[PDB]
Design a protein around this ligand. Sequence first.
Ligand SMILES: [Zn+2]
Lengths: 95, 189, 346
Amino acid sequence: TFLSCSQYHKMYRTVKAITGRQIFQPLHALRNAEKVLLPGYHPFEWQPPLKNVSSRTDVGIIDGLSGLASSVDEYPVDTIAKRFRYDSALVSALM
Amino acid sequence: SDHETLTAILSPLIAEREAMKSSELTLEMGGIPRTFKFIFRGTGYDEKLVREVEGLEASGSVYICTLCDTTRLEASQNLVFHSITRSHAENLQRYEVWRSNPYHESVEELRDRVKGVSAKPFIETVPSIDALHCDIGNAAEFYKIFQLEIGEVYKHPNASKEERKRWQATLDKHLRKRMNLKPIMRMNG
Amino acid sequence: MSLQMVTVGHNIALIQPGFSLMNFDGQVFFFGQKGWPKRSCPTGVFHFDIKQNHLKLKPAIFSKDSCYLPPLRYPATCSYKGKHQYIIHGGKTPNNELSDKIYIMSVACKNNKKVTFRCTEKDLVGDVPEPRYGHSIDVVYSRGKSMGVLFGGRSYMPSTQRTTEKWNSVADCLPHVFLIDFEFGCATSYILPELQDGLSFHVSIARNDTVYILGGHSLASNIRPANLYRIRVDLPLGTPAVNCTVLPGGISVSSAILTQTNNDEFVIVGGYQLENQKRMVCSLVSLGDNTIEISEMETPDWTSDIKHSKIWFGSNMGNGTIFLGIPGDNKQAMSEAFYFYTLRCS
Ligand SMILES: [Zn+2]
């Protein structure tokens, strides 16, 4: 429903205030169930392994520039880009 | 169209994409762990992008088909008899022939030899046809042929480029009088 | 010292930072467009002809037998004046690969200001240097022969430590010296034991037997050293020899622009002082027989748009003349992203 967090919290608190029960969940409980659904959560093994590829399986958001050094002597860049890695999002979509 | 930043961002992704075409994947899928292989088909590029990254020139060329190798002028004589004949590595080696210029040919005769390619292929693809822009381009072309055929120019050609705007106006007005259509230019689906 | 502003052609888009201005026969030429060569001119090299502060970038066709070269974006260039020709090595393709091959620019025929260039692909043998950019080549003579000195610059990681999270990162080449024969394209590296730290975007002068290097930008500590180094090569009929000496009285400058303002007399225009300080005050160097003297040049005028900008770039047109370019204005939105200037030295 594309609802922001704050209004979701208000909905939560007034539902718990009206009915006495607890049907919605609080927000920290939301994020700690969210982190199972991004890329970068589950262990896996590339075999035979991949050259030029960091073998850690705890990769979520990194910057898209790949740490492209960018100062006043080099080529000027102006863009922002965020990305996963390919295998990370691939295993997350598979699971 | 800013080619520099686009290359410098997307090249890690094409590095990883080339990397995982020769491996197996192993992970726990609800109980027992299982394995995987992959086959990729980069297809969902429109027409302009695949003319821009695989190594062709801009759109208004003479070599038109991104699959076969024929002149635009050739398709007027022979209509339907070609086949797909454009790999990726072939465009790589043709780029090599372009940069080397072995036979010391002209600019023009070499461009006639290489069949259009004048840039390094940057990415891989499979060759195919996009459906959406096929439909949209056909609709625009039929809109063009109606705006023509109201002007009756099969009998007399080459009128001014103002009466054709008038025929455009009367076609939109009449079709709104017979099908009740709102007038727009960016031809939505 | 005479600044002047300059009007712009219609296809201004071909100018980018990291270009190259070669100067053939009193006739300037432009190379290193942004983006691949379009269908309107497949070479990429253009007539940089300028008249009454209006430039008219006419194209330039090649010979019948040249090798069509991609736009290298930060090459090493120098003047092999031995039948004038230029040398191109290194650079950076638009796909951010890095070639290491050498390209030699020469002329075939000039008939009423319509010129035909001629460039040749040159491959190397021996200890080929790693493909890199920002470095500096220079030619030198001794004892009736000539050789090419090549001082290293920044490059990518090798094929092992290059990781897909740090893919575009960059480290200096190991500060060695490369000597190159162009009669056959022979290569030889030498480990000089006096220069230790890496350096890039330095300024190189060659006076017929000796090569002078100043400025430059170290990466490892990320500073700009205040020194200069004299390199004496020598060409006996036996083995060629390398030698170096640090010399005091240097400056810290990074990515500046040189020009031959007079016979054995040069000027360094400003660059960057600190990581945000663009260097404004320019300098001049008298390059004597075996001495070398840097000195304060008379502080030429700037417009407010120059002294309130943040980055510039440019190169050496050839005769006491440099061409200079800054990006557009964010608070003065109506722009074609770039504006330009020209400095003379008479
Ligand atoms: Zn075809």
